[PDB]
Write a protein that binds this ligand. Structure first.
Ligand SMILES: N#Cc1c(N)sc2c(F)ccc(-c3c(C(F)(F)F)cc4c(N5C[C@H]6CC[C@@H](C5)N6)nc(OC[C@@]56CCCN5C[C@H](F)C6)nc4c3F)c12
Ligand SMILES: Nc1nc2c(ncn2[C@@H]2O[C@H](COP(=O)(O)OP(=O)(O)O)[C@@H](O)[C@H]2O)c(=O)[nH]1
Ligand SMILES: [Mg+2]
Length: 170
C-alpha cells in the first residue's frame, strides 16, 4: 500500500507556487504559468524508504472565507508557506497564511514549512536571518528554494511529508 499525503502550497501571487509544484512533479521550470489556475498534481516518491503518493494542491484565485472553502482547506495535511526572497510584501503576508491554517485546522501544531523561493536570483530584499527568525517563532523549518534550478525543492516537500508522518504518530 502507499500512504497518500495531502500537501497544500500557499502564499502571495507570483511567489512561485506553480513553478515549485510543476518543478517537483515534472522536473522542469515552467516560467510564467497562468497566475489564475488552481489545480492539484500527484507524484509517487520514496522518502526514507517509504513509497508514498504526494497529492499537491497549487492554490490560486480569490481570497474567500465561505464554510466550503474552509472545509476544502481543512483536508490539507501539511502546508508549504511560500514567499519570494525578492518580494518583502510576500514575506510580510506569511503570518496571515499561517493564521488561516491554524484557524481551519484548530491547532497551532499543523505540519508546515516556510519556503523562501527564487534563491537563484542574486538580489534578495528579504533578510535570510529575518526568515529564519520567523520560522523559529513558529517552530517550523525554513528552506530556501529555486523552482528554476530545483535547488531545495525536494527538501521542502520531503521535509513537509516527514512532518506530517511525525504528526500522525502523536
Ligand atoms: N482564502 C482562504 C483560505 C480559507 N478560507 S481557509 C485557508 C487556509 F487554511 C490556508 C490558506 C488560505 C488562503 C488561500 C487559499 F489557500 F485558500 F487558497 C488563498 C489566499 C489568498 N489568495 C488571493 C491571491 C493571493 C494568493 C492567491 C490566493 N491569489 N490571499 C490571501 O490573502 C491575501 C492578502 C492580501 C490582500 C488581503 N489579504 C490578507 C493578507 F493581507 C494577505 N489569503 C489566502 C489564504 F489565506 C485559506
Ligand atoms: N528566477 C525565478 N523565477 C521564478 C521562480 N519561481 C517562479 N518564478 C517566476 O515567478 C513568476 C511567478 O511564478 P508562479 O509559479 O506563476 O507563481 P504563483 O503565482 O505563486 O503560482 C513567474 O514569472 C515564474 O517564472 C524561481 O525560483 N526563480
Ligand atoms: Mg500559480
Amino acid at each position: 500500500g502507499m500512504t497518500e499525503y495531502k500537501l497544500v502550497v500557499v502564499g502571495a501571487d507570483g511567489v512561485g507556487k506553480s513553478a515549485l509544484t510543476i518543478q517537483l512533479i515534472q522536473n522542469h521550470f515552467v516560467d510564467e504559468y497562468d497566475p489564475t489556475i488552481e489545480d492539484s498534481y500527484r507524484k509517487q516518491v520514496v522518502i526514507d524508504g517509504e513509497t508514498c503518493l504526494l497529492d499537491i494542491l497549487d492554490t490560486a484565485g480569490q481570497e474567500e472565507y465561505s464554510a466550503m472553502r474552509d472545509q476544502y482547506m481543512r483536508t490539507g495535511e501539511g502546508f508549504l508557506c511560500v514567499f519570494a526572497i525578492n518580494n518583502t510584501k510576500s514575506f510580510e503576508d506569511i503570518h496571515h497564511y499561517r493564521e488561516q491554517i491554524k484557524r481551519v485546522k484548530d491547532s497551532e501544531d499543523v505540519p508546515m514549512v516556510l519556503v523562501g523561493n527564487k534563491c537563484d536570483l542574486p538580489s534578495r530584499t528579504v533578510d535570510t536571518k529575518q526568515a529564519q527568525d520567523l520560522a523559529r517563532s513558529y517552530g517550523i523549518p525554513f528552506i530556501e528554494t529555486s523552482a528554476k534550478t530545483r535547488q531545495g525543492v525536494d527538501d521542502a516537500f520531503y521535509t513537509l511529508v516527514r512532518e506530517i508522518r511525525k504528526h500522525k504518530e502523536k
